[PDB]
């Protein structure tokens, strides 16, 4: 079919668009034979040429038009691979951040969109690390922060409360002390929208972690003859101080959280007092 459309190489429509470009764009989308027609990226990020590279030197304009038609049809994974083939790392991580953002806090289910998008992002991350490919520092920092947040929510949903706490402490996204609140509110202004959209769920998960550690401390009845009572009172005071820092932070951020989120944060603190 591509041999026949090459006769249209000099033909233009009434708008001046190339008829060859149009027919090839329809052909690639209908056949779904992207790697064969348009070529594929290797692990080094060299492009293996497709069938179309025989006919034109401007394969990049073709791949971008096909990618835009795939995006408009809702084929976002294929559109991301095609924009990447259009030699755009920056675009890969930008689109992957947009795709990961709504699924970060979700519970992992077998065959879920979250698990598929996570596995896609991990495969991109492993390959870009092995090839030494870096996008723009802003986009790249957002991408790895979304991956670390997926790990935080995996450990949280697995019930590994102490490991999920160590991850959120390392990420420095939320204040774990009253003194850190102003610094973190200032830092919040520099986060991307993809991270800001997840902040309500991060605060709820972090507050649930603190509340569950507090319940474990109170439910450990007095039957271990040998732990000094002062170390328990000090740890209770610290968890309540951390919980207060999260609420003070949630109230100071220039971001309108859901009314249910703020109500649940305050309700968990009242149950810790």
């Amino acid at each position: 079919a591509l041999q026949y459309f090459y006769f249209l190489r000099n033909e233009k429509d009434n708008q001046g668009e190339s008829m060859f470009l149009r027919c090839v764009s329809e052909l690639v989308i209908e056949s779904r034979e992207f790697d064969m027609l348009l070529g594929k990226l290797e692990k080094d990020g060299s492009r293996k040429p497709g069938a179309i590279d025989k006919f034109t030197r401007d394969t990049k304009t073709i791949i971008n038009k096909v990618a835009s038609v795939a995006e408009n049809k809702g084929l976002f994974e294929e559109a991301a691979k095609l924009y990447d083939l259009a030699k755009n790392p920056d675009k890969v991580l930008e689109l992957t951040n947009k795709l990961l953002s709504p699924v970060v806090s979700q519970i992992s289910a077998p065959q879920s969109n979250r698990e598929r998008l996570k596995n896609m992002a991990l495969a991109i991350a492993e390959r870009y690390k092995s090839q030494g490919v870096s996008a723009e520092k802003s986009i790249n920092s957002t991408f790895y922060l979304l991956l670390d947040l997926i790990t935080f929510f995996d450990e949280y949903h697995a019930g590994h409360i102490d490991l999920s706490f160590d991850v959120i402490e390392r990420l420095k996204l939320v204040p774990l002390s009253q003194d850190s609140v102003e610094e973190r509110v200032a830092a919040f202004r520099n986060f991307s929208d993809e991270i800001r959209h997840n902040l309500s769920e991060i605060l709820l998960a972090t507050m649930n972690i603190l509340f569950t550690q507090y319940k474990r401390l109170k439910g450990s009845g007095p039957t271990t003859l040998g732990r000094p009572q002062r170390v328990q009172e000090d740890k209770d005071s610290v968890l309540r101080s951390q919980a207060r820092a999260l609420i003070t932070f949630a109230g100071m951020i220039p971001y309108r959280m859901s009314g249910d989120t703020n109500a649940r944060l305050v309700q968990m603190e009242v149950l810790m007092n």
Binding site: A263, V270, L271
Partner: protein, 57 residues
């Protein structure tokens, strides 16, 4: 305003918040169960929120 609005819940007229006054209808056991659960959920929470407001102020 918060104090007034939480008192309108805690002091809701004629037998209290989420309680039927008219018993001359068929019993919906699913509805009556859900209302009792919401009372156990919402009323302690409202009391703790009001305590928190009054204590911090």
């Amino acid at each position: 305003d918060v104090k007034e609005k939480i008192y309108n819940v805690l002091l809701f007229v004629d037998g209290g918040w989420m309680v039927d006054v008219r018993e001359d209808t068929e019993e919906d056991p699913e509805r009556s169960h859900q209302m009792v659960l919401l009372r156990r959920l919402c009323l302690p929470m409202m009391c703790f929120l009001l305590h928190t407001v009054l204590h911090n102020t």
